[PDB]
Amino acid sequence: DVNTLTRFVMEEGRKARGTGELTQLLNSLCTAVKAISSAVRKAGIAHLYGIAGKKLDVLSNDLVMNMLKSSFATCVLVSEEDKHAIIVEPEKRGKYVVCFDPLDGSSNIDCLVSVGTIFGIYRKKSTDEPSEKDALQPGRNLVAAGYALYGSATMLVLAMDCGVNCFMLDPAIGEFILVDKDVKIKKKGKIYSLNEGYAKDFDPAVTEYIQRKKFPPDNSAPYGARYVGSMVADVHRTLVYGGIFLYPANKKSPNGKLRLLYECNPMAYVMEKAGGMATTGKEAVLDVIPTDIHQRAPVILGSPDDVLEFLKVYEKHS
Amino acid sequence: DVNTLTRFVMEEGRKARGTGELTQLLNSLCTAVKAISSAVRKAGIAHLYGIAGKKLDVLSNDLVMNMLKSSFATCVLVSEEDKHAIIVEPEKRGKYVVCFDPLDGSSNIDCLVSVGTIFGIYRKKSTDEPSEKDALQPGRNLVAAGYALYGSATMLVLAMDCGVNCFMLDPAIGEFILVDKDVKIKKKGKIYSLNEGYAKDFDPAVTEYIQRKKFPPDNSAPYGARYVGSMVADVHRTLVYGGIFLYPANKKSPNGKLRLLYECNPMAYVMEKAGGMATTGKEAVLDVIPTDIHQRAPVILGSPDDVLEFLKVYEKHS
Amino acid sequence: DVNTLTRFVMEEGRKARGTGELTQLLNSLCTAVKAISSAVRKAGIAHLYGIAGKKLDVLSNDLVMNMLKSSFATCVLVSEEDKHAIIVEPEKRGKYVVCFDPLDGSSNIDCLVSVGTIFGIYRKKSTDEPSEKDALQPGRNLVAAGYALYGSATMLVLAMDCGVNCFMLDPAIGEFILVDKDVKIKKKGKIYSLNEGYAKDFDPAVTEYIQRKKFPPDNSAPYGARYVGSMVADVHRTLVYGGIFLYPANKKSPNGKLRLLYECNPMAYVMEKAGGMATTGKEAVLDVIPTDIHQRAPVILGSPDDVLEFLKVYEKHS
Amino acid sequence: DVNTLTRFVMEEGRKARGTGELTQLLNSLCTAVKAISSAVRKAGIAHLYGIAGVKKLDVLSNDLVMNMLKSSFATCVLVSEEDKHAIIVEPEKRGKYVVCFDPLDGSSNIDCLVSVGTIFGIYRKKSTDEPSEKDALQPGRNLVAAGYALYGSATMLVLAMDCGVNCFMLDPAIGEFILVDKDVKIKKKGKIYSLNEGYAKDFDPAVTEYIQRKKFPPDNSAPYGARYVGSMVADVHRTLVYGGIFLYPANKKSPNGKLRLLYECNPMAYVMEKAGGMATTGKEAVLDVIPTDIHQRAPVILGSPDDVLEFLKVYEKHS
Numbered sequence A, B, C: 001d002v003n004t005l006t007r008f009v010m011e012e013g014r015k016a017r018g019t020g021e022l023t024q025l026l027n028s029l030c031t032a033v034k035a036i037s038s039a040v041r042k043a044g045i046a047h048l049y050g051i052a053g054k055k056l057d058v059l060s061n062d063l064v065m066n067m068l069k070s071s072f073a074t075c076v077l078v079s080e081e082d083k084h085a086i087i088v089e090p091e092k093r094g095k096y097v098v099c100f101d102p103l104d105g106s107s108n109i110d111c112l113v114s115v116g117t118i119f120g121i122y123r124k125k126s127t128d129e130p131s132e133k134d135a136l137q138p139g140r141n142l143v144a145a146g147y148a149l150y151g152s153a154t155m156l157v158l159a160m161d162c163g164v165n166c167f168m169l170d171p172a173i174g175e176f177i178l179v180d181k182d183v184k185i186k187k188k189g190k191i192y193s194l195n196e197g198y199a200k201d202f203d204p205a206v207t208e209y210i211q212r213k214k215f216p217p218d219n220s221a222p223y224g225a226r227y228v229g230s231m232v233a234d235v236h237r238t239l240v241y242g243g244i245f246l247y248p249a250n251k252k253s254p255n256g257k258l259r260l261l262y263e264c265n266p267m268a269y270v271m272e273k274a275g276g277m278a279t280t281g282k283e284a285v286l287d288v289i290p291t292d293i294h295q296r297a298p299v300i301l302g303s304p305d306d307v308l309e310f311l312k313v314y315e316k317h318s
Numbered sequence D: 001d002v003n004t005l006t007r008f009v010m011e012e013g014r015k016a017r018g019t020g021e022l023t024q025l026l027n028s029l030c031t032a033v034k035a036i037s038s039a040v041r042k043a044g045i046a047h048l049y050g051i052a053g054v055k056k057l058d059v060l061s062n063d064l065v066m067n068m069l070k071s072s073f074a075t076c077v078l079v080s081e082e083d084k085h086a087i088i089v090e091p092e093k094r095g096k097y098v099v100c101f102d103p104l105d106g107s108s109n110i111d112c113l114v115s116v117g118t119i120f121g122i123y124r125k126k127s128t129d130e131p132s133e134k135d136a137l138q139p140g141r142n143l144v145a146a147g148y149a150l151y152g153s154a155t156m157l158v159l160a161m162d163c164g165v166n167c168f169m170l171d172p173a174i175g176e177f178i179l180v181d182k183d184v185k186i187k188k189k190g191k192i193y194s195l196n197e198g199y200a201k202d203f204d205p206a207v208t209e210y211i212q213r214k215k216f217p218p219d220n221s222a223p224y225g226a227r228y229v230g231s232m233v234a235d236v237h238r239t240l241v242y243g244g245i246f247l248y249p250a251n252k253k254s255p256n257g258k259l260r261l262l263y264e265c266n267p268m269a270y271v272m273e274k275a276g277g278m279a280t281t282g283k284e285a286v287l288d289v290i291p292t293d294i295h296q297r298a299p300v301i302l303g304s305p306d307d308v309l310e311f312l313k314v315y316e317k318h319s
Ligand SMILES: Nc1nc2c(s1)Cc1cccc(OCP(=O)(O)O)c1-2
Pocket: A009, A010, A012, A013, A014, A016, A017, A018, A019, A020, A021, A022, A023, A024, A026, A143, A160
């Protein structure tokens, strides 16, 4: 029995017995993602080169912004591309707050590296006029989150209370087909992912942990290394193959580099729903209470046994 | 003035004043690539999931094999998928020998990591009946080589005596548009790429070189690290951003891990034509004389200054 | 503010405050149409011709059948492709009955003539076991109807109580974009459409009417003639440009040739919702009470002034 | 063994042992057609409607063909419906071919999503002097190649040359024209007649009688069926595939017909003759008419031989 993102979303919405807003929000998001995917695969680039005789990041941001606003399901929108939280005009306001990164990893897009869209959805908790404050909720309050990976193929990973489901975009009919239901990450993996070019500035715990992956003190097989440089790609591989992903804090960056609202929380949410873990080293990413919409946060996530092991090393240096 | 792969190839062929065979071979390869790209982006996956009530690597291999045979321009075909060299039937034999990897990186495709097609084209040298021996030529004899990267977007990099040219596939019209003419790699980069999970087994020279990238002895800025795990993706980033890529021998791969005929030689050829370098440590990849179609070869390639620097360290440990 | 078929359908469904079934049915129908469109435009035909070394009407029928069944919104399905009404298995039954022609005009498909999908949706009006009898309702009971035209471009015309809306399929993202809201047909047109090859067998009223279009009584300019041979194409042109379409009953087809349940009623419903008319000559198509799911019905539809004029001629010969 | 437009064209070009220009011209035309098809199927129309918060199709199509042909370095004179005057390719991009074309035939009624197409005719410049409009004034008999692209239920490119007529289907998944019908030949006699009967009042007596014979066969055989899309490429293609006859004759108001000789009539007449069919103006074969104006009109009756011959019989009776 084939299932599509539209059908899946509509059914979960029916079960929730609500107003149908989140359904419309998700449908709009879905449409924006297919539009971003089309642009990422360079549809029509021939016209840009004169066959008939301006940035992907900005276009992606416009697509999400416009689709979400026109869904009438949102009131506050926080994007990695905008300095201030966007406030939806009164006549199009819904009860949801959305934090997102329209095109994650679009800084190296010149090498055709995988890129993606990350998003986190919250329910406005206060009756106050919508403001940036409404997006300052701990990831623990997420109602839904996920990402779209524009890699060899386009996939949308959607996480909610019912679990994590993966949909593959069929370009022939512009439909997201459900190919992986209630996904669970491997208990322990064999791959570690992080930019080792920062070795010199690594925190001692990170240095020792990576050293244990390369030189297992018990002489077991060393972990393999992978680092794409695009969070959505690295996190998705971690979910699919298991293992651990790190973008830790150091003396020069006490809070890390990745952003909490639209990068860390969404991925941490997907991880926990899949039976994985996501920590900053001091606490679970989802429990961090934000004070600034663009605040950074250190993050170590992936297979539970792997994160637990990291925390063990971290505790030793604490 | 727009230019397409078809137009470009046809023009270069006209200038060569030959039989037009290589033109037909390249046109056929081009068609196979677009077909592979369509399958990689999962066109029609909905039918596989029951919307109406073969493995990618095998399909890709079939596409290349069939298009090349039907081009009447080849006589011996070596592929990563087949144990023995395929010999084209007499009535479809041409004078070219093609070595290729239909879908490079298709092993970690579950995570939607970038994948690609690598190829190297040789002119049959010996006059004996076509056999596997015709594919045992040093990369120095290549007439043309390149790859197709199926990443955020699909691009075909084609290298010939005239240089390296990059074409972007416009999915809207199924046409490869020329977007980068006579490409040259940066003299020196700031990124090193290799699987550091093998640290324990690294040869001393590799260990020291990597150490110099992380802890510059001249206290300059440390290089950044990237490792996708897919050769076409890692090599393409190296070409575009500069830097160095390594897959040196391991103690469990005394002769390196990558294959000489359809992975190393093609990439080394593209690098040299772009002003870059490609060495095994002992000699230029292109000068190695193969004795077996699937033999492995160590490889260090990328920006000249970076490779030269590695060779300096290598020589110190020799 | 852009609007999509999905968004539109979901909103009208929310306002109806029902179970959401019709929403699920329409979404499923939408997905089936995009799949049919992809196959009609011949996606993948290259594989059929050996690039790598079922009939369209059957496939189309399977797509609609499977999507509708899996929607859990239907119970009785009538298709021009199946002699007997299909009864949905108990575990997938919904309250709707759907009559449709999977691929109208697929008989003359070899000439690439426009083809389409016609559908009519009824609410099961009985409390007993679903049977063919549930599809024998007069078009007057339709809850929704429309068609998909696979012409120069693909468009879905959907008619409901709120009116007629036209959606254009954007192939790049597989999304139906609303381009024409609350469409109304011209009061009077300048085009008449019917197969004049049947002149010899025409009913005197039809003969006189056509005669008035060619040799105008009020010395007005003669109407232009157009006859594609595909109902969806001819009817759509009528809706867009106005005028009249005819497929009357001659001497051997006293009951016409087109089918009442999945050709005539749906188009008649779209016409009336657009301010147009649809008559059999004796009564409004929508008022005919069917006794056989495949019974034929004569039909004259289009601009009101044009149909009224035909009826005037018809009455003179009655 | 699969074959594509590119492969086919490259092979025929190799056999001709020429400069390769026509190959580049055809490759360029092929690319332009795929781009036109993409636009006709409305790719990206969502952006036109604000999904992210514009020129006419006929104009775009004309630009695509013009630009691709110029950039092919194989042409010198280009005649299209869009520009009143023949376009002269700048010296640095001049080739030896002359191309007459209709970028988007039937785009006057593209609102109803009716089938549309691109028609083209290719000539070799037969003068040594400076390229001018005069080089496009050759009888269709001189055509080196001609054909059309039909943007209907699916997109197909029909290419006619000395070797015959070949039909290629565009596979949108890979942007490749796949050869699906080799050396096509039209049926000797068909059962369908096509023309705008709304002009009955102004029909020439011969046309009136001929149509009368199709509807009321004298020997009481089965009457012909009628089809009229209103788009020449669609009507002509159906004629080629199913056989029969297509007419757009001269009448009271239009003594020289309505269709254009250089980029509508000649190309279709050439495809018909190469397929074993016929194309007459009533007085002579369309291909033999010597044009004096690049946009001159010409009456046309084409299709299955037996059907055209029969028309000519009626025509001669009224002459
Ligand atoms: N389309 C979907 N909606 C919901 C999903 S999936 C999961 C969920 C949990 C709680 C309320 C919801 O919806 C609440 P409302 O927005 O309908 O009021 C939903």
